[PDB]
Ligand binder design. Structure first.
Ligand SMILES: CCCCCCCCCC[N+](C)(C)[O-]
Ligand SMILES: [Cu+2]
Ligand SMILES: [Mg+2]
Ligand code: NA
Ligand code: NA
Ligand SMILES: [Zn+2]
Length: 334
């Protein structure tokens, strides 16, 4: 209430081609996973084997920077019109965010939370806290394995046939209970640090445990793709990006939330990948070989998130959309 609230893009609509198929976009908002331990970026361990095996169909972005080093900064920033370097916390809090605008355009927006909170971003859209289900197959000590989200996916997919944006907010690589982020099938690197007292384990075991968390991210993204890839009637996109990275003892630094100005690359350099369904490849208007090249050669950040999502919903009458910030715009047919 401190300053008047600005509704943005009040006349927004979708401008999808006439007679088009449903468009279903999944935004996986990761947590703590860093670029330097991401197999597709050339890490010496293959922490992303399922995505690597999918080959050309996964677009990987080797140079992406976060807008903050904690969830409290990164989430509101990445869902706002503001860029990191001009972010105004107060202004952002008193205006519509990305999800408010997309919902106003008539898109079904749903937020499934498994990471302790949306930091105010999903207040005005349908949202559920999946962690609270406290299912023994996934959950212990108030935290749940991210595959619990998959159990709620089909309900969203089948809610109706409107275009949709589904946000899956994952707990990812969050520590210091890194060992609780994955299961036996992803416990590849050993020995591990099976305590929250990470300062008491060797740096070698800490890296091993963190790397196992990335294997779980990889299989999670793969399972989301598997829910969509056989729906030939559906134009689907899966987009994954982390909120920030992590420090694993380098120079005495652990966890995250270092002030951005002094934050090491481990905390600011984050993974990002995209996958497109067959129908999206056919009717989505994107030159895929163009996009693979752009992804390899350019530097991106959370600043690109807002316009990339608007572009994926064919949003029109939008004064917030910036073509130069839309990752796909330079490879989209006019
Ligand atoms: C307060 C930080 C906001 C970011 C603005 C960075 C300058 C953009 C203008 C660049 N330009 C070459 C056109 O002058
Ligand atoms: Cu206020
Ligand atoms: Mg932004
Ligand atoms: Na945690
Ligand atoms: Na194992
Ligand atoms: Zn975080």
């Amino acid at each position: 209430s401190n300053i008047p609230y600005t509704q943005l893009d009040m006349a927004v609509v979708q401008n999808r081609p006439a007679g088009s198929l449903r468009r279903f976009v999944v935004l996986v908002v990761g947590e703590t996973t860093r670029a330097a331990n991401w197999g597709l970026n050339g890490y010496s361990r293959q922490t992303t084997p399922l995505l690597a095996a999918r080959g050309d169909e996964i677009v990987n972005f080797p140079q992406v920077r976060s807008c903050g080093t904690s969830t409290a900064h990164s989430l509101p920033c990445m869902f706002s019109t503001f860029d990191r370097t001009d972010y105004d916390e107060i202004k952002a809090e008193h205006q519509d965010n990305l999800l408010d605008i997309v919902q106003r355009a008539g898109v079904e927006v749903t937020w499934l939370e498994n990471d302790s909170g949306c930091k105010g971003v999903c207040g005005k859209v349908p949202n559920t806290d999946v962690t609270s289900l406290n299912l023994p197959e996934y959950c212990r000590n108030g935290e749940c394995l991210d595959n619990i989200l998959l159990t709620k996916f089909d309900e969203v997919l089948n809610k109706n046939d409107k275009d949709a944006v589904l946000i899956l907010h994952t707990i990812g690589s969050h520590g210091p209970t890194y060992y609780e982020r994955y299961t036996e099938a992803e416990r590849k690197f050993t020995p591990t640090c099976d305590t929250n007292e990470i300062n008491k384990c060797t740096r070698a075991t800490l890296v091993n445990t963190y790397d196992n968390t990335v294997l779980y991210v990889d299989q999670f993204i793969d399972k989301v793709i598997r829910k969509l890839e056989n729906r030939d009637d559906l134009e689907s996109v899966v987009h994954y990006v982390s909120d920030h990275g992590e420090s694993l003892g380098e120079n005495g630094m652990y966890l995250h939330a270092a002030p951005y100005a002094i934050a090491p690359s481990g905390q600011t350099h984050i993974p990002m990948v995209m996958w497109f369904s067959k129908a999206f490849r056919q009717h989505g208007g994107i030159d895929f070989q163009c996009l693979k090249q752009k992804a390899a050669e350019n530097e991106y950040s959370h600043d690109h998130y807002f316009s990339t999502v608007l572009g994926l919903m064919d949003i029109s009458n939008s004064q917030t959309y910036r073509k130069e910030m839309d990752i796909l715009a330079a490879c989209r047919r006019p």
